[PDB]
Design a protein around this ligand. Structure first.
Ligand SMILES: CC(C)(COP(=O)(O)OP(=O)(O)OC[C@H]1O[C@@H](n2cnc3c(N)ncnc32)[C@H](O)[C@@H]1OP(=O)(O)O)[C@H](O)C(=O)NCCC(=O)NCCS
Ligand SMILES: CC(C)(COP(=O)(O)OP(=O)(O)OC[C@H]1O[C@@H](n2cnc3c(N)ncnc32)[C@H](O)[C@@H]1OP(=O)(O)O)[C@H](O)C(=O)NCCC(=O)NCCS
Lengths: 363, 363
């Protein structure tokens, strides 16, 4: 009996690999760090999706296809508002997306499809966020980037060069991350020759859960409690004496430091001095990591992604509610990618179980 | 590497057990045959759900709770029609159900909930079927049974004592059937402390697939090709000579005959002479099973459930399109049951995978 299937390797894939020991994470042959830092979400997507970075012309077309599928169909826009006020932006995303499922979505999923999804997700998220907040809806525009457009349809403004570059590098890191609950959920779902939508819809439903992609509220508060760098040590020092734990650090699967968390701290340095909510984090990190050395010497505890995900959001006034969604919109790539591959060489996840209950006699 | 996880037992459960070798299938301690044959869907549901048959008063209340949650909320009825004509009754069921997800549906799923779902599913299915068929909508009625109400909201009439008893015994057999694609899908989905709806929505999406609960069209035609018992042997005999295979027989997991298929043929005999579409099947079976003995002696090939599922439908003018749905509405019990249990003692399905692709050097 393999409870929760830990250590059970039920899949073969050339999309991504995560290596706890060696501190590394690879996307289709390249390092995540490199993609997060020196590329654009779109390039990234295109990689996880197809297998290589895109040519100078190769890309421009991909964008077009995207930019075009951002518009919310007439009835969809309408539906989002049909949906009553008691529905997480999540409970919704899940619903709405499902609403996209038609005849067009048959067994063999199609890039055409994987694309629509990836591209439209943020729009749903936003139009919905706006509506609930009684703000007037903001239509996407073939004019901005992808990660940048996501901001625009949410706020109405164009983000700081820093606020942007950061988020982007973030989403990219959230794009794909091996086999995890949801990603596995979709595969499983497509396992019965089902549709891309039904798979994403599944995965989505699975993301809603709090154990996967939940806001780092625990961290967000940490930061919110010390707006200035001065109080840096003070705070840490206090709760580090009666043994309380420092929220954004240490990891279950990363024995060495987290590459994602790493690729983030780095981009931050690049755009330092342009965003107080960010440059603060930088400090808090560096000042906290050197205090762990002190109070808990030996135990290699390194800053974990969750930490910076908390920071980047803090910088862009993305309250906790918009976390998971935003995350989803990104892992959306990972999913499709995984779906598209599951379908390449299918399977039938039929696992079995042990029956507890007593059995009746044939008599 | 365990591809598709065959032989992998990742779950413990006291809901159901399927035993290929010995020709038996057990629901919470009782035999399916017995439940299918001598009980009412509601009793059945109540069993898979709670663990025992219901008391004389114990039941009546369950019904009430059901009968009450059959009504389609104001906006839901409306939504079903919002949904464009290009959407399988399935693509819809999946959507709509998801539409039910609110705040009420949090981590620990609740019977209150498992119930609403089970009870409302058919209604969705129907109201939708009607609308597409340009028929006027038919409101459910606290007056008929459950399986019987499903017919009513679909047709507008009250089914033959035979047409009824049959279908009911059918759905009951479709209720739960161990760990299978979807049922597993829901568990997986709830694995991250998600909601009942998101789980069912997942499972649903997984059912849509053609490899799970697809119509036995292959069989349905067999029957449709010989309206009268006379042509019985004739037909069979022909395609059985150049080695063509007889669609409703033999099974992958049932070495001995299928109990479901069995529990069905039986109920049929009980209500013989009252339904030509049914009494025909009876014959075709018996006349075909005795021809297999003849052409392929030795190989214990026994009639398989799929066969009768094809027949019962044929009798009630339930074209192939309504198959999966109808099936879903039933397995809906199995699901909830399984969800409700997954949550009792959760887990985290984190399985892992083998990366094909080449890795880059640290450099
Ligand atoms: C995930 C976990 C616990 C790391 O797993 P592991 O270190 O491999 O397994 P552990 O039980 O933690 O190892 C025990 C040790 O961790 C140390 N440790 C880890 N994080 C610590 C922290 N923030 N503060 C103090 N000690 C910490 C303990 O001091 C202990 O070392 P000693 O017994 O020698 O003193 C991580 O340290 C953590 O708690 N992170 C905060 C939760 C989080 O990531 N939240 C994000 C969403 S809110
Ligand atoms: C599912 C399957 C193939 C049974 O699995 P198994 O019998 O365990 O594995 P098999 O490959 O079939 O065993 C091979 C044998 O099956 C026999 N067989 C099974 N069903 C047969 C049929 N309908 N007609 C003729 N032979 C059949 C073959 O004759 C062969 O025996 P021999 O080589 O000695 O002649 C089943 O027989 C079948 O084909 N059913 C029809 C498909 C179905 O169930 N459809 C429902 C949805 S449309």
């Amino acid at each position: 009996v393999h409870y929760g299937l830990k250590g059970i390797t039920c899949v073969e894939t050339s999309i991504s690999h995560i290596d706890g020991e060696k501190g590394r994470l690879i996307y289709r042959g390249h390092h995540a760090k490199d993609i997060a830092l020196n590329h654009s979400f779109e390039e990234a997507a295109y990689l996880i999706l197809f297998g290589k970075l895109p040519s100078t012309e190769e890309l421009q077309v991909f964008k077009d296809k995207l930019a075009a599928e951002r518009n919310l169909p007439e009835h969809i826009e309408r539906l989002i508002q049909s949906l009553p006020n008691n529905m997480d932006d999540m409970s919704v995303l899940r619903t709405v997306v499902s609403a996209l499922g038609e005849n067009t979505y048959t067994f063999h999923p199609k890039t055409e499809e994987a694309i629509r999804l990836i591209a439209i997700t943020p729009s749903i998220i936003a139009y919905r966020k706006r509506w609930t907040r009684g703000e007037q809806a903001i239509a996407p525009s073939s004019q901005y980037g992808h990660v940048e457009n996501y901001y625009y349809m949410l706020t109405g403004e164009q983000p700081s060069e820093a606020k942007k570059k950061a988020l982007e590098t973030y989403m990219i890191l959230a794009t794909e991350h091996g086999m995890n609950a949801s990603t596995f959920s979709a595969r499983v779902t497509l396992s019965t020759e089902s549709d891309l939508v039904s798979a994403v819809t599944a995965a989505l439903g699975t993301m809603k859960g709090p154990l996967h992609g939940g806001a780092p509220s625990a961290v967000t508060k940490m930061l919110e409690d010390i707006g200035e760098k001065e109080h840096a040590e003070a705070y840490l020092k206090e709760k580090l004496e009666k043994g309380e734990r420092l929220m954004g650090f240490g990891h279950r699967v990363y024995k060495t430091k987290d590459p994602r968390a790493e690729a983030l701290r780095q981009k931050a340095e690049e755009v330092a001095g342009n965003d107080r909510d960010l440059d603060l984090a930088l400090h808090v990190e560096a000042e906290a990591i050197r205090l762990l050395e002190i109070y808990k010497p030996g135990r290699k505890l390194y800053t974990n992604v969750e930490f910076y995900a908390a920071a980047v959001m803090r910088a862009i006034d993305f309250d906790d509610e918009l976390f998971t969604p935003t995350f989803s919109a990104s892992r959306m790539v990972g999913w499709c990618a995984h779906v598209l591959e599951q379908a390449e060489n299918n399977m039938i996840f039929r696992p079995s179980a042990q029956y507890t209950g007593a059995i009746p006699e044939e008599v």
